């Protein structure tokens, strides 16, 4: 399997970026396999 990379741009803060999304606060746990899961 041929896995390769292509440059897509600079790492830069853009002033005219689309703004969206909320900011939920969540209790989670991280297990040994790197999976987060919700916690009550």
């Amino acid at each position: 399997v041929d896995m390769y990379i292509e440059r897509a741009g600079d790492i830069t803060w853009e002033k005219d970026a689309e703004v969206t999304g909320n900011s939920p606060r969540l209790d989670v746990a991280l297990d040994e396999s790197g999976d987060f899961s919700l916690v009550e």
Partner: protein
């Protein structure tokens, strides 16, 4: 080798993820490459460090990204979705509350091939990578950062 954000492709071709080239090291998420060698031009990038629990891997050298979310400011996801030009999505992160401390998290849902896209602070520094998270049906990705 050049600094920038890169697509991670496989062979038609499919974009499986995204990564960050900085200080001669390529950073991406473990679940994107599983540590497999990468091709860039006529050259080959060999894995150097990887960790399944952090879901991170670095190539050619040790993890170089160390900026962190300040806990108060808006950040920007530099998303590179398959078949689309790199774009910045500004947002205010939420918080993953864990027993080992809090982690910033962004409630943004982009196609799977966007995993590994960098999250930036106002100064343009990479504070983590996008693509490991939870579902609350809405997906929320931790801001995943390594240790330099």
């Amino acid at each position: 080798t050049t600094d920038g954000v890169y697509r991670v492709m496989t062979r038609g071709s499919t974009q499986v993820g995204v990564g960050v080239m900085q200080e001669g090291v390529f950073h991406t998420m473990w679940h994107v490459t599983k540590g497999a060698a990468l091709r860039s031009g006529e050259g080959r990038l060999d894995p150097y460090w990887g960790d399944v629990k952090q879901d991170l891997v670095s190539y050619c050298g040790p993890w170089k990204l160390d900026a962190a979310w300040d806990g108060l400011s808006e950040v920007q996801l530099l998303a590179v979705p398959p078949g689309e030009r790199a774009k910045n999505i500004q947002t205010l992160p939420g918080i993953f509350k864990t027993k080992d401390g809090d982690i910033g998290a962004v409630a943004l849902d982009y196609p799977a091939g966007t995993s590994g896209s960098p999250i930036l602070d106002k100064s343009g520094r990479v504070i983590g990578l996008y693509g490991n998270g939870v579902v609350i049906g809405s997906y929320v990705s931790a801001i995943t950062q390594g240790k330099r």
